[PDB]
Amino acid sequence: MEAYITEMVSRERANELEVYVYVFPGVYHIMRAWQRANDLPLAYNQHTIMAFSPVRHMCGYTPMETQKRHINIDSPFERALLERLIKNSLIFTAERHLHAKRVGHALRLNQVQQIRQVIIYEAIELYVNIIENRISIGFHLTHQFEYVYTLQVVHSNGRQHYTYLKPLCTFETMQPQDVLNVSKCIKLSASKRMKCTYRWIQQLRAQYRHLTFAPNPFTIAQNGYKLDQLSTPKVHFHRDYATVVSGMKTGKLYKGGNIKISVLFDEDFYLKHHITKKDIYQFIAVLQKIAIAQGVNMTISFHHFTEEVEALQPIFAQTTVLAFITSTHLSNKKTRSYQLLKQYFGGKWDIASQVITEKTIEAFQKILHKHGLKNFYPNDEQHCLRVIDVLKNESFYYTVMNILLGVYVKSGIQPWILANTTHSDCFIGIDVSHENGNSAAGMMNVIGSQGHLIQQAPLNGILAGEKIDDTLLANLLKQMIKAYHTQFQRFPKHITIHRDGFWREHTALVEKIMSHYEITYDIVEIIKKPNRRMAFFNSVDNTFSTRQGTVYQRGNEAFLCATNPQQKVGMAQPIKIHQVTKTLPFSHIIEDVYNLSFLHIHAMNKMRLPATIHYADL
């Protein structure tokens, strides 16, 4: 089985709820005075105050008018007020009958764990919306942290935020060793999460009276959603391969080439860890043999380095660098080497995935010893081939590719593309945030039908949810259209614009440009943190399971599950898709979004976002 969602819809339409409305000649103290007395939930907007029951024993003030009415469906002012009132009523009943506590933006609800000096509480988060005259409540389960020791530049007291008597607990203020334990403890499975949410939510509705729900309101059939299953697209290496892994194991890359590498080796591998010199040569020979088997000619240049004579680019000058550095120095963020590596890689790249550390060398030695191939000449072809064949069937194999792909993207190499064209012809992506959602430097990408990059331009400013300037947006759109025209000798007939976040730009300018060049277009918003979860329920074994490529569709909104994570990492996080323009069918939009996410050419494991809004810097 049964599709589920962390959502629930009441059987009472928003225009059949009777409310008391008071108008005053915005006002904030009036609500507080009326809420302290008579102990009732309220809401306000501007000078208007809305409540569910008639207020009695007023502290003061004389409203211009008092009414017992319904609301106006078409009034944007009377809908946000009712949403606020419903959310406040839910918080009221949760805080009274369920003993929850309003902290920050969520409600602490119970106790789960304590690690060292940190208590971990589970907090529920509620969202109320009015869509097609129906009230829908969505909810999320998160975790909040609190230090246990009391004081004998930021301070906090429960919900009271005296930020500048115990201190606050945040990921920024965590100790280096506490982060790993906290992240491990926060991890929850699909069944644990989707049962802990449902238990508390269905306890909430037992003590609620203003709205009524079905006995089983969490099924997607009770929410107006429609289920869809999407097939996995094929990829192209030199023919049609069903899976990326199969192509990487027994295929030739889409584009080859030659690479000159300035290998960066740290001396600490010898002074402290006692690693033999020939081991580095053996590892490099293995990598070169694999690359030559893939059709890429890795050519070696070593560069034993320390902190002297850095002078910005130390010895590399924006060339491809193979990194050898100890994990103990990698963990230390204060080290200049880690900062330089981050600057060379960028925000999108993860530092620890493409860097060879002593742990990788130790695993290579363990494999070599355990298979009786610890002594082989690097220059011997048969020995290297046997080592490759041994490593092909191990779990270490992935790691090797995580390095090779790492030096393939940065060297202007395209490993694979899509084997079939999408429904649209060109994709323009505007990425102004990290993968989790936190803001970062902006980037505009242009992608063809089968996923090959066309153009890429930086975007400055846009620090926090700001509309892009009209002049800059027009210049960028014209530049990308001209780039496509130059490369393809034509003009696109359909362009999809993927936006990271909410669309705040001037749609009239886009319409004018598209009509000037006679190009049809669509605008789609992708939300990376929908704060929702989706799963299937099996009653025979009574568990919840997430299946990759699953679509829930309602109106012009959709939820997409595009990953299949293991039970060890956690639970799959969905993607929200919203269509603004109505030019193309929305199912085709969802399918294109799903297909563009199979272009994780930077890493061996599948990514969550489409490549339009998740792409490396050049």
Give the span between the Cα atoms of 324 and 265, in whole angstroms: 5
Helix, strand or coil for residue 286? helix
Cβ burial, residue 300 (10 Å; 0-12/13-18/19+): middle
Give the span between the Cα atoms of 58 and 407, in whole angstroms: 71
Decide: 432 and 462 in contact? Cβ < 8 Å: yes
Q: In 3D, which of 408, 394, 445, 413 has the Cα closest to residue 596?
A: 445
Helices 470-488 and 507-517 pack at an angle, to 10 degrees, of 30
Q: Which residue in the block uniquely carries the two structure tokens 């990059």?
A: 453
Give the span between the Cα atoms of 143 and 435, in whole angstroms: 20
Residue 279 CA from chain centroid, whole number: 38
Spell out the long-range contacts of 301-307 with Cβ–Cβ below 8 A and sequence spacing 24 or more: 301/260, 301/261, 301/262, 301/263, 302/263, 302/265, 303/262, 303/263, 303/264, 303/265, 304/265, 304/267, 305/264, 305/265, 305/266, 306/267, 307/336, 307/337
Output phi, psi for 614, to 5 deg.
-135, 90
> What's 106's DSSP letter?
E
Going 195 to 198 to 204 to 207, the CA torsion angle's sign is negative
- CA–CA distances in Å: residue 182 to residues 120, 187, 455, 530: 9, 9, 41, 23
CA angle 105–111–115, rounded 5-degree value: 100
Helix, strand or coil for residue 308? coil
Give the span between the Cα atoms of 604 and 409, in whole angstroms: 12
> What's 231's DSSP letter?
P
- The two beta strands, 534-538 and 543-545, are antiparallel
Decide: 17 and 53 in contact? Cβ < 8 Å: no
Q: In 3D, which of 332, 266, 269 has the Cα closest to residue 302?
A: 266
Helix, strand or coil for residue 346? coil
Output phi, psi for 293, to 5 deg.
-65, -30
- CA–CA distances in Å: residue 497 to residues 437, 447, 613: 18, 11, 10
Give the span between the Cα atoms of 305 and 318, in whole angstroms: 16
Q: Cα(first)–Cα(last) distance of the chain, in Å?
A: 44
Decide: 322 and 292 in contact? Cβ < 8 Å: no
Helices 396-409 and 358-370 pack at an angle, to 10 degrees, of 130
Give the span between the Cα atoms of 518 and 454, in whole angstroms: 20
Return the CA Rg of the chain. 28
Output phi, psi for 377, to 5 deg.
-75, 130
Residues 6+ apart with CB under 8 A from 392: 249
Count CB neighbours of 207 within 10 A: 11
Residues 6+ apart with CB under 8 A from 257: 296, 297, 411, 412, 413
Give the span between the Cα atoms of 235 and 424, in whole angstroms: 18
Helix, strand or coil for residue 363? helix
Count CB neighbours of 180 within 10 A: 10
Q: In 3D, which of 416, 410, 495 has the Cα closest to residue 452?
A: 416
Count CB neighbours of 176 within 10 A: 9
Q: In 3D, which of 425, 444, 443 has the Cα closest to residue 488?
A: 425
What one-character-per-residue DSSP string does 170-189 give? -TTT--HHHHHHHHHHH---
> What's 166's DSSP letter?
P
3-state SS, one letter per residue, for 444-495:
EEEECCCCCEEEEEEECCCCCCCCCCHHHHHHHHHHHHHHHHHHHCCCCCEE
Give the span between the Cα atoms of 110 and 157, in whole angstroms: 18
User: Pseudo-torsion of CA 397, 399, 402, 404, nearest 10°?
Assistant: -60
User: Pseudo-torsion of CA 279, 283, 286, 288, nearest 10°?
Assistant: -120
Decide: 444 and 476 in contact? Cβ < 8 Å: yes
Residues 6+ apart with CB under 8 A from 573: 529, 563, 608
Structure tokens at 586: 């929305």
Give the span between the Cα atoms of 193 and 190, in whole angstroms: 5
Give the span between the Cα atoms of 545 and 564, in whole angstroms: 10
DSSP H helical segments within 100-238, as ranges? 176-186, 190-204
Residues 6+ apart with CB under 8 A from 170: 145
Count CB neighbours of 51 within 10 A: 22
> What's 232's DSSP letter?
P
Sheet holding 42-45, edge to edge: 42-45, 48-51, 19-23, 65-69
Going 327 to 332 to 333 to 338, the CA torsion angle's sign is negative
For this PDB entry, the determination method is cryo-EM
Give the span between the Cα atoms of 252 and 189, in whole angstroms: 38
